[PDB]
Scaffold this motif. Structure first.
Motif, PDB file in Angstrom:
ATOM      1  N   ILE A 152       4.084   7.260  -4.773  1.00  8.55           N
ATOM      2  CA  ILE A 152       2.810   7.153  -4.066  1.00  8.55           C
ATOM      3  C   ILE A 152       1.827   8.223  -4.544  1.00  8.55           C
ATOM      4  O   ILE A 152       2.100   8.932  -5.501  1.00  8.55           O
ATOM      5  CB  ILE A 152       3.046   7.231  -2.533  1.00  8.55           C
ATOM      6  N   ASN A 153       0.685   8.330  -3.887  1.00  2.65           N
ATOM      7  CA  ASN A 153      -0.190   9.482  -4.080  1.00  2.65           C
ATOM      8  C   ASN A 153       0.035  10.565  -3.053  1.00  2.65           C
ATOM      9  O   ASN A 153       0.484  10.281  -1.938  1.00  2.65           O
ATOM     10  CB  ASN A 153      -1.644   9.059  -4.068  1.00  2.65           C
ATOM     11  N   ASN A 154      -0.323  11.795  -3.422  1.00  2.00           N
ATOM     12  CA  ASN A 154      -0.073  12.974  -2.577  1.00  2.00           C
ATOM     13  C   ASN A 154      -0.722  12.912  -1.194  1.00  2.00           C
ATOM     14  O   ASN A 154      -0.126  13.310  -0.188  1.00  2.00           O
ATOM     15  CB  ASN A 154      -0.525  14.261  -3.294  1.00  2.00           C
ATOM     16  N   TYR A 155      -1.951  12.429  -1.142  1.00  2.00           N
ATOM     17  CA  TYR A 155      -2.748  12.624   0.064  1.00  2.00           C
ATOM     18  C   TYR A 155      -2.181  11.835   1.235  1.00  2.00           C
ATOM     19  O   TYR A 155      -2.254  12.298   2.354  1.00  2.00           O
ATOM     20  CB  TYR A 155      -4.248  12.346  -0.165  1.00  2.00           C
ATOM     21  N   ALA A 156      -1.587  10.673   0.978  1.00  2.00           N
ATOM     22  CA  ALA A 156      -0.982   9.894   2.062  1.00  2.00           C
ATOM     23  C   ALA A 156       0.046  10.728   2.834  1.00  2.00           C
ATOM     24  O   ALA A 156       0.070  10.686   4.065  1.00  2.00           O
ATOM     25  CB  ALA A 156      -0.348   8.613   1.542  1.00  2.00           C
TER      26      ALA A 156
ATOM     27  N   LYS B 221       0.815  -1.200   0.000  1.00  2.00           N
ATOM     28  CA  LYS B 221       0.000   0.000   0.000  1.00  2.00           C
ATOM     29  C   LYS B 221       0.860   1.266   0.000  1.00  2.00           C
ATOM     30  O   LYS B 221       2.027   1.238   0.409  1.00  2.00           O
ATOM     31  CB  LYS B 221      -0.925  -0.008   1.230  1.00  2.00           C
ATOM     32  N   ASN B 222       0.273   2.372  -0.452  1.00  2.00           N
ATOM     33  CA  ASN B 222       0.935   3.672  -0.415  1.00  2.00           C
ATOM     34  C   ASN B 222       1.342   4.105   0.992  1.00  2.00           C
ATOM     35  O   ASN B 222       2.439   4.600   1.183  1.00  2.00           O
ATOM     36  CB  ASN B 222       0.035   4.753  -1.012  1.00  2.00           C
ATOM     37  N   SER B 223       0.457   3.929   1.968  1.00  2.00           N
ATOM     38  CA  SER B 223       0.778   4.237   3.372  1.00  2.00           C
ATOM     39  C   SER B 223       1.975   3.442   3.866  1.00  2.00           C
ATOM     40  O   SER B 223       2.810   3.967   4.586  1.00  2.00           O
ATOM     41  CB  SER B 223      -0.421   3.949   4.281  1.00  2.00           C
TER      42      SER B 223
HETATM   43 FE   LIG Z   1      -4.941   4.845  -1.641  1.00  2.00          FE
END
Ligand SMILES: [Fe+3]
Length: 308
Positions: free
Chosen positions: A192-196, A174-176
């Motif tokens: 990853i994605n930004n929001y994490a 996972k990204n987290s």
């Molecule tokens: Fe996600």
């Protein structure tokens, strides 16, 4: 009162629904689900659907609904509220993009600097980065990244990138988890994605994190933004309140409610995120066609062929 089929995160959806109920006195009922399943349900239900609005994390799910004649037009004034350069527009003015999420490179700034970063996401999948780049092959946004590479650079490049990650990258579930691995000193950077990252930084304070974000920008495939949005169903027997909900989502207060709840880029120019995101325009997101189911199937085939 209105019924919203919701494919977006429950916190985003709950927060804008509640701010809507409080602003207008109109009650919102969510029917949550995965966007692709909800879209299928809307096509099957046709002119007898109970849905007034479809609220989705991914505007790509709208194209088929629009082409099937199931979406109502939205106000031109409403569409214009989020129509920044680069933001996808419904050719038939029958859905609206509201917010975005970005691919990013997270890096341990005590081990690497902006100077060590690459001009292209393609270059992270090379021997220079062996044992040094985390990626998350099972993530929806990772699949979107493969689709964009395929569309923008062709299949040979996409496959070569995936083969390079196989060879050089560290796989995380996972990204987290990829973010934790960067914070923990296990890998110096990850895709990853930004929001994490902005979630973690809001929680702990940026000064207390080892990790920083590098945005590749300049319309590189690695600058990919995925867009959330809304549409009114043509079949709705409450157009008036459905349209008022979509207008609210595009309004300053609706966008303020969204960005307080979730680290998405608002597409209004006059709303700043309390997560301290940069303005959408600074991302320099590429312009890419909507991901179809067929696109997803093809990207999965490439991931399989790369041994991932
Ligand atoms: Fe996600």
């Amino acid at each position: 009162d209105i019924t919203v089929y919701n494919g977006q995160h429950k916190e985003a959806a709950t927060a804008v629904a509640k701010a809507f109920e409080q602003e207008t006195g109109i009650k919102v009922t969510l029917n949550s689900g995965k966007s692709e399943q909800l879209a299928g349900q809307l096509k099957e239900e046709g002119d007898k659907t109970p849905a007034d609005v479809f609220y989705t994390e991914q505007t790509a799910t709208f194209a088929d609904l629009s082409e099937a004649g199931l979406l109502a037009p939205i106000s031109e004034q409403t569409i214009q509220q989020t129509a920044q350069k680069g933001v996808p527009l419904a050719p038939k003015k029958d859905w609206i993009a509201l917010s975005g999420r970005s691919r990013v490179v997270v890096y341990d700034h005590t081990k690497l600097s902006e100077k060590d970063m690459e001009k292209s996401v393609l270059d992270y999948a090379t021997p220079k980065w062996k044992g040094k780049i985390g990626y998350v092959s099972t993530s929806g946004a990772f699949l979107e990244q493969v689709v964009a590479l395929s569309k923008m650079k062709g299949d040979k490049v996409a496959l070569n990138w995936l083969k390079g990650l196989k060879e050089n990258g560290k796989l995380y579930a996972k990204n987290s988890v990829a973010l934790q691995a960067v914070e923990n000193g296990e890998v110096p950077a990850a895709l990853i994605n930004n929001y994490a990252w902005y979630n973690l930084a809001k929680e702990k304070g940026v000064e207390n994190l080892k990790s920083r974000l590098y945005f590749v920008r300049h319309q590189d495939p690695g600058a990919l933004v995925s867009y959330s949005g809304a549409a009114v169903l043509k079949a709705s027997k409450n157009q008036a309140e459905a349209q008022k909900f979509v207008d609210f989502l595009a309004s300053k207060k609706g966008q303020e409610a969204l960005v307080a709840a979730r680290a998405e880029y608002p597409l209004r120019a006059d709303v700043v995120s309390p997560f301290n995101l940069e303005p959408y325009e600074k991302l320099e997101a590429p312009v890419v066609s909507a991901t179809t189911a067929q696109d997803k199937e093809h990207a999965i085939k490439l991931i399989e062929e790369a041994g991932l």
